[PDB]
């Protein structure tokens, strides 16, 4: 289910940091953080920690379909343990830092960065804080 959504019509990319703090209830579930663009509610960036396999899956949902998955084996998450995910975008990538260490970068596929106006957080995450801050 949808746990949190934010809308910033002036565009939250590039140059904004998103910090999500929370914890996941189950050791077999998953959550996701999506950045969506208008028009068409396309998913520019989908970030999906999967606890059953201890993998992070990233992708984009453009032209009504997913593209190639980018799978990361660095998995700094444990069920029921608080975590902090920071996502920052520059001209070329989304950058992910978890518990203050750099984890991965994801090259933009949606180039219309300024049309990325929506943040969505779904599924198994009990959110304690969301911060959205201009840094660029």
């Amino acid at each position: 289910a949808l746990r949190f959504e934010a809308l910033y019509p002036e565009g939250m990319c590039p140059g904004w940091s998103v910090v999500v703090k929370g914890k996941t209830s189950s050791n077999t579930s998953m959550f996701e953080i999506n950045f969506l663009s208008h028009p068409g509610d396309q998913i520019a960036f989908h970030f999906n920690p999967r606890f059953a396999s201890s993998r992070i899956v990233c992708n984009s949902f453009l032209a009504n379909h997913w593209g190639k998955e980018e799978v990361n084996k660095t998995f700094p998450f444990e069920a029921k343990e608080p975590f902090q995910v920071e996502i920052y975008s520059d001209q070329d990538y989304f950058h992910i830092f978890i518990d203050e260490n750099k984890i991965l970068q994801y090259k933009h596929r949606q180039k219309q960065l300024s049309s990325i106006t929506k943040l969505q957080i779904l599924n198994d995450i009990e959110i304690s804080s969301v911060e959205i801050t201009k840094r660029g």
Copy 2:
């Protein structure tokens, strides 16, 4: 991927030691050592050092689900450096050591100890030795 598996059909629990020597390839991946019960290769005991968070998770898959995870208080391992892990079983626990220093004990949840016939080692460990030894004078 599977790095090593051993099968001792008469049952390697309780009263056996397993010594695993090796090192990780990555600073931020993980490996696991599982003890599997027969029939079905069922996960009686799962030991999972996780280098991204520096946490050890232990659990068992019983009655169709993972049980309560035990997250160890300490994480003595260093990535990309040789280690020696020793695991021994008695009637009550798996006892785990690094360098012969105790890390943790895990109380048996699967009570059919004699059905634990397989040792399986998965994911980010470059193995240099596995020794499986019956403890005399049990």
